[PDB]
Amino acid sequence: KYENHTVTLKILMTLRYVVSDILKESRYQYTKFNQPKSKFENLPQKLLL
Amino acid sequence: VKAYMFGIVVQNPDTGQPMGDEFYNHILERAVGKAERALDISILPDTQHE
Structure with missing residues (x-):
């Protein structure tokens, strides 16, 4: 039915x-x-997403 | 004793060693001695020659 129609969502x-x-x-x-x-522990990293 | 301290654990911070039962028995023996003085009592079965 919408062969040459536009559609938006x-x-x-x-x-x-x-x-x-x-x-x-x-x-x-x-x-x-x-x-x-x-003991050696790695603390949190900060990420730029 | 540990049951009454449920959720609390005691360790030597420099090591992984918690205090053994030896200390607890030693403490408990002097505790039952102290209670034995706190009332003028004999608190364990013991023969007397009077």
Whole structure:
């Protein structure tokens, strides 16, 4: 029925992102309290999406 | 004792060593001694030559 008609839509789509830069990229702690020995833990990165 | 401290665990922060039962028994023995003085009582079965 709509061979030569126009069609328009209002649509919902899932949010999506890509990492375009990594910022304040690494933060660190030698956690030692209440451990058998010194341990290295990487704290949260910040991403610019 | 641990049951009354449910959810609390005690360790040496420099190591992974929690205190063993030896300390608890030792503490409990002196605790039952202290209660034995707190009322003028004998609190464990014990023979007496009087």
